[PDB]
Amino acid sequence: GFLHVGAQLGTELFIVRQLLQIVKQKTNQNSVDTTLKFTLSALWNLTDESPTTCRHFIENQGLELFMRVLESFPTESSIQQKVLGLLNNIAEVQELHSELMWKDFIDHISSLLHSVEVEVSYFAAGIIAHLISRGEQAWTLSRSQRNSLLDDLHSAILKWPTPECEMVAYRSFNPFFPLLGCFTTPGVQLWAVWAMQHVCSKNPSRYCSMLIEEGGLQHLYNIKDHEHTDPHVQQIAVAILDSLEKHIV
Amino acid sequence: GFLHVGAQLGTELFIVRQLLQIVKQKTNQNSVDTTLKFTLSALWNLTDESPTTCRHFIENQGLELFMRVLESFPTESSIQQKVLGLLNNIAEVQELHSELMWKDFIDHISSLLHSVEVEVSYFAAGIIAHLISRGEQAWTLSRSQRNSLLDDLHSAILKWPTPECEMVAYRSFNPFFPLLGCFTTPGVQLWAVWAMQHVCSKNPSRYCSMLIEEGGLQHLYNIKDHEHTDPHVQQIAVAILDSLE
């Protein structure tokens, strides 16, 4: 039994508030411990495909707190990964895009894009890819920074080695599909196809069938068949398609 | 995206541990505040039909903490209801029965059965009903206490007024069905039919179709036609049936 009809949502939101309170306490104490790491993991996990949780995070000063986490722990790669992983989930929510148009936030993300650790850079890239995908008018910060970020995003992806593990898990590829259509901003497409390639090659039994079942073949074929595709985007799309085509047969 | 495949279970259990830490802190501070009330609500909600969450609660000293809560806040009805609501969920898990065969725990439940507030007594009665339903050999405490609890359970239910609103929500009636067959312990059946009548009369659009779809009618018919049925069990069972037929 439980408190009342509908009470589970109120409990979910309370849990988010209390996890942010732990983050705040650990950050105040400059204490990187197991509790903080499990707390950042939990918030990342709870924001997965959950606009309701993403919104509640924003409304409880989560963005400011998480910038404080990055400033307080600049040498903690695993902390940065979990912070950025959550923020990548926020960045997928179009209704929250305006909440991320904050110079202190974008400047932190832009700098972490240049981390040599792929486990950090990858999520900074995902945030930027989603934000840039929404178009120049949706971008209410400096136009010059948006244009620079476009090039930095493209160049950063091309430097990444093959990571040792899956850096992330996905329940669905649906959030990536709008990115695959962004022909006028190739770095956005490049992040999406690199991401799909990474998880499909690491874990094809989980992800290849999922990608096909959700309609990924048509989206990838539309990139391949597009006349004037960025050469790096085209190459990863073709590489993914070859794997997928062998998977169906 | 999320941490790694299968990570949500580890997050769920961590959340339980951290909610228990909050209960411990508020009890240490003697602070009946909104955060404590939401934390107890959260734990109640998280143990709903969740044997794995109930076990984790037990393994992180939840039972002793909740006894301490009951001792620290002896006249806080809202706190007592939320503590007992969670414990009612534990009492539903057969595999955890022996963890509740603890004299100090049962003495607390027995005391709350005698609350003048039905919103507290109801959940103490639920714990007792589930624990008694498991039979005499599973009851490893005093046989004398089992027999008095069975009497006290029956008489408590007969005193309850109609509550002002639904005291609890359920996702399923399935945990009540084993209680409906306990003809040799009528107080256990009485709690189960009283509880069914309560939610069906307060919220028929949610609960009447649920009862029907899950096979509740056959259990009530079983009671209606059984030879030497306790009259109060019989009356409510017939009232529920007649409300549907």
Q: Could you report how far apart the first and last alpha carbons of chain A are, in Å?
A: 48
DSSP result, B40-95: HHHHHHHTTT-HHHHHHHHHTTHHHHHHHHHHH-TT-HHHHHHHHHHHHHHHT-GG
Give the distance from residue B228's alpha carbon to the nearest chain A alpha carbon, in angstroms. 31
Domain-located, residue A2? no
CB-nearest to B1 from A18, A35, A48 is A48
- What is the dihedral angle through the alpha carbons of B90, B93, B99, B104, rounded to the nearest 10 degrees? 40
Contacts of B3 in chain A (CB under 8 A): 41, 44-45, 82, 85, 168-169
Question: CA triplet A236, A241, A246: central angle to 5 degrees?
Answer: 135
Give the distance from residue A41's alpha carbon to the nearest chain B alpha carbon, in angstroms. 7
Domain-located, residue A85? yes
Report the distance separating Cα A213 and Cα B82, nearest Å: 44
Question: CA triplet B45, B189, B149: central angle to 5 degrees?
Answer: 85
Report the distance separating Cα B201 and Cα B193, nearest Å: 12
Extract the tokens encoding A86: 């959550």
Give the distance from residue A146's alpha carbon to the nearest chain B alpha carbon, in angstroms. 24
Report the distance separating Cα B110 and Cα B120, nearest Å: 11
Residue with tokens 């992983």: A85
Domain-located, residue B2? no
Q: Phi and psi at residue A154, in whole multiples of 5°?
A: -60, -50
Asked if B129 and B176 count as a contact pair (C-beta separation under 8 A), the reply is no
State the angle between helix axes of B7-28 and B62-72 in degrees (0 to 180), rounded to the nearest 10. Answer: 30
Across the interface, do B44 and A2 touch by the CB < 8 Å criterion?
Answer: yes
Helices (H), strands (E): how many in chain B? 13, 0
Report the distance separating Cα A151 and Cα A146, nearest Å: 9
Across the interface, do B38 and A7 touch by the CB < 8 Å criterion?
Answer: no
CB-nearest to A44 from B2, B35, B169 is B2
State the angle between helix axes of B62-72 and B77-91 in degrees (0 to 180), rounded to the nearest 10. Answer: 160
Tell me which residues of chain B have a C-beta less than 8 Å from any C-beta of chain A.
1-5, 7-8, 10-11, 14-15, 18-19, 22, 35, 38-39, 41-42, 44-46, 48, 82, 85, 88-89, 166, 168-171, 203, 206
Taking residue A139's Cβ as centre, other Cβ atoms within 10 Å add up to 18
Report the distance separating Cα A90 and Cα A16, nearest Å: 14
Domain-located, residue B75? yes
Resolution (A): 1.9
DSSP, collapsed to helix, strand or coil, labels residue B169 as: strand
The residues, any chain, with a CB within 8 Å of residue B93's CB and separated by 6 or more, are B51, B54, B55
Method by which this entry was solved: X-ray
Q: Phi and psi at residue A167, in whole multiples of 5°?
A: -85, -10
Residue type, B172: S
**Exposed e or buried b per residue across A62-101, where buried means at least 16 C-beta atoms within 10 angstroms of its C-beta:** bbebbbebbeebeebeebbbbbbbbbbbbbbbeebbebbe
Contacts of A37 in chain B (CB under 8 A): none
Q: Could you report how far apart the first and last alpha carbons of chain B are, in Å?
A: 50
Asked if A46 and A16 count as a contact pair (C-beta separation under 8 A), the reply is yes
Domain-located, residue A72? yes
The residues, any chain, with a CB within 8 Å of residue A120's CB and separated by 6 or more, are A77, A80, A81, A84, A112
State the angle between helix axes of A77-91 and A62-72 in degrees (0 to 180), rounded to the nearest 10. Answer: 160
Domain-located, residue A17? yes
Beta-bridge partner residues of A2 = B169
Extract the tokens encoding A73: 């722990």
Asked if B236 and B194 count as a contact pair (C-beta separation under 8 A), the reply is yes
CB-nearest to A4 from B4, B15, B169 is B169
Residue A225, Cβ density class (10 Å: 0-12 exposed, 13-18 middle, ≥19 buried): exposed
Across the interface, do A19 and B19 touch by the CB < 8 Å criterion?
Answer: no
Tell me which residues of chain A have a C-beta less than 8 Å from any C-beta of chain B.
1-5, 7-8, 10-11, 14-15, 18-19, 22, 35, 38-39, 41-42, 44-46, 48, 82, 85, 88-89, 126, 166, 168-171, 203, 206
Residue of B nearest to A170 (CA): B1
Domain-located, residue A1? no
Report the distance separating Cα A166 and Cα B109, nearest Å: 49
Asked if A46 and A59 count as a contact pair (C-beta separation under 8 A), the reply is no
Report the distance separating Cα B33 and Cα B26, nearest Å: 8
Asked if A141 and A101 count as a contact pair (C-beta separation under 8 A), the reply is yes
Residue with tokens 């009862």: B211
Going A110 to A115 to A117 to A120, the CA torsion angle's sign is negative
Residue of B nearest to A89 (CA): B1
Asked if B115 and B78 count as a contact pair (C-beta separation under 8 A), the reply is no
Across the interface, do B3 and A38 touch by the CB < 8 Å criterion?
Answer: no
DSSP, collapsed to helix, strand or coil, labels residue A2 as: strand
CB-nearest to A15 from B42, B85, B170 is B42
- Closest listed residue to residue B69, CA positions, set B90, B57, B83, B55: B83
Contacts of A45 in chain B (CB under 8 A): 2-3, 7-8, 11
Beta-bridge partner residues of B2 = A169
CB-nearest to A42 from B11, B35, B88 is B11
Asked if B72 and B30 count as a contact pair (C-beta separation under 8 A), the reply is yes
Instruction: Quickly list H helices, chain A.
Output: 7-28, 34-47, 51-59, 62-72, 77-91, 103-113, 118-133, 143-159, 177-180, 186-202, 204-213, 216-225, 231-248
Rg (CA), chain A: 18
Structural domains in chain A (count) = 1
Report the distance separating Cα A238 and Cα A230, nearest Å: 12
Extract the tokens encoding B145: 């206490």
Across the interface, do A10 and B85 touch by the CB < 8 Å criterion?
Answer: no
Domain-located, residue B127? yes
Give the distance from residue A192's alpha carbon to the nearest chain B alpha carbon, in angstroms. 13
CA distances to A13, A66, A121 from A52, in Å: 9, 18, 26
CA neighbours closer than 13 Å in the CB half-sphere of residue A44: 28
Extract the tokens encoding A221: 């074929």
Contacts of A15 in chain B (CB under 8 A): 15, 19, 42
Report the distance separating Cα A9 and Cα A13, nearest Å: 6
Asked if A103 and A75 count as a contact pair (C-beta separation under 8 A), the reply is no
CATH number at residue A110: 1.25.10.10
Residue B190, Cβ density class (10 Å: 0-12 exposed, 13-18 middle, ≥19 buried): buried
What is the extent of the structural domain holding B99?
A: 7-244
Extract the tokens encoding B239: 């009232």
Asked if B126 and B135 count as a contact pair (C-beta separation under 8 A), the reply is no
CB-nearest to A4 from B5, B15, B166 is B166
Asked if B207 and B243 count as a contact pair (C-beta separation under 8 A), the reply is no
Give the distance from residue A28's alpha carbon to the nearest chain B alpha carbon, in angstroms. 18
